[PDB]
Scaffold this active site. Structure first.
Site, short mmCIF file in Angstrom:
data_model
loop_
_atom_site.label_atom_id
_atom_site.label_comp_id
_atom_site.label_asym_id
_atom_site.label_seq_id
_atom_site.Cartn_x
_atom_site.Cartn_y
_atom_site.Cartn_z
CB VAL A 22 -0.97 0.01 1.19
CG1 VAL A 22 -1.92 1.19 1.11
CG2 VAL A 22 -1.74 -1.30 1.29
CB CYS A 23 0.89 4.40 0.29
SG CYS A 23 -0.80 4.91 0.38
CB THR A 24 5.89 4.90 0.00
OG1 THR A 24 5.69 5.13 1.39
CG2 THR A 24 5.51 6.18 -0.73
CB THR A 59 4.38 3.98 -5.19
OG1 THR A 59 4.67 4.08 -3.77
CG2 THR A 59 4.89 5.25 -5.87
N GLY A 84 -1.06 -1.14 -4.27
CA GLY A 84 -2.12 -0.16 -4.16
C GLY A 84 -1.58 1.25 -4.03
#
Lengths: 230, 230
Positions: free
Chosen positions: B103-105, B123, B152
């Site tokens: 998820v994200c970074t 990212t 995600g």
């Protein structure tokens, strides 16, 4: 502090549905200058319904006067609805909080505390019949607002209403900035988040699976209502 | 157990963005027979970026072989991208896990671990330029899938891909049942969850506010890339 610190409090109780809390927590904790509290009878570990362990930061007695109170839901609501200390705390804070909010069956706790009488409100769809006995005008919407009362139906409704709260406490640009910085852009891969859109077979499964919990929660609700009526 | 227990693990690290973890955790923990782990160098308290305290349940060494691994993001990713033990753990688990997710970074951690080379991935939008140096084919979609790799973009993307995982590990009816039982029905009150839909002023604010973090994360990413290249 150097700016006005909005005091935001979540009830953290055994067998909470943790995402109901942790979603709005992360959004609201992103806002300028705020102080966010996880409130229980005592600080320390509290186990969520999944087994995930959260930490309460303050007792009822030590919690500052809240500007925002939020009661999440979960299995643990049934006990909370008959917890005299917790209900007294919630009533005290709700008397002056600018915002009184809940997620899923957290609204049934507000109801047990006498805070829903004559108010439009929602709760988790499987328990919606429990609103009227607590005096609420039952409404089927994702987030129901009546004045300063905001009740969310489903698990992440607090994420969404947290952005509404952000916009009113701060401004719309601030709420939008937080949404963008977090990159909150939901897009579920199924459309089964409402009994009106899920397949009938899935609704039947869910209603059969919730039957015993509903039966118990109904018994609890009727006892809670009778206390308010006396 | 009496049924096959899917082993699901989340990396829990200091300064994680907790909702990135706790969202998919609550969905996946709802699935039949599963066992869900919160993994760090040691069990015990880990402080999220908001100050909210989570509890790791297992060390790297004691974590079972995972079927699903998920690396959440947050401020703490920068340290994790140069944490030799954490990267070795992630590579070990990713070698055989059925699903490798982030998820994200968190995807930049996968990247630092050498797991994105030639893979389509995303990212967090503010850091998207850091994918190509880690060998990824950068894609701007909410959830990017390449085989068994799911990355995600935004904070709650794991809630959404958790339902995809549910459907494949179990069946669609199971995923739908969980969505309905949780009543996961998002509807944000703003449309600022993408830099392409937020107001330009809000995007400018967010990009100025992320500049120092991006600068540091870029330095880290380039060091990580150079290690992989050697």
């Amino acid at each position: 502090g150097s700016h006005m610190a909005v005091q935001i409090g979540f009830l953290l109780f055994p067998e909470v549905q943790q995402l109901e809390l942790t979603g709005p927590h992360d959004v609201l904790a992103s806002l300028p200058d705020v102080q966010v509290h996880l409130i229980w009878k005592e600080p320390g570990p509290v186990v969520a319904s999944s087994g995930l362990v959260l930490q309460a930061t303050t007792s009822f007695a030590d919690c500052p006067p809240l500007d925002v109170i939020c009661i999440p839901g979960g299995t643990g609501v049934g006990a909370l609805m008959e917890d005299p200390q917790a209900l007294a705390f919630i009533r005290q804070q709700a008397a002056r909080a600018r915002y009184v909010t809940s997620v899923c069956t957290g609204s049934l706790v507000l109801g047990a505390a006498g805070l829903l009488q004559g108010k439009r409100a929602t709760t988790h769809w499987a328990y919606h019949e429990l609103l009227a006995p607590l005096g609420a005008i039952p409404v089927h919407e994702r987030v129901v607002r009546d004045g300063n009362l905001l009740t969310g139906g489903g698990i992440t409704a607090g994420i969404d209403f947290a952005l509404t709260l952000a916009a009113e406490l701060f401004d719309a640009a601030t709420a939008q900035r937080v949404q963008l910085q977090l990159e909150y852009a939901p897009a579920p891969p199924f459309n089964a988040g409402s009994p009106d859109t899920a397949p009938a077979s899935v609704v039947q499964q869910a209603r059969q699976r919730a039957a015993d919990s509903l039966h118990k929660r109904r018994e609890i609700t009727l006892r809670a209502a009778a206390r308010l009526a006396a």
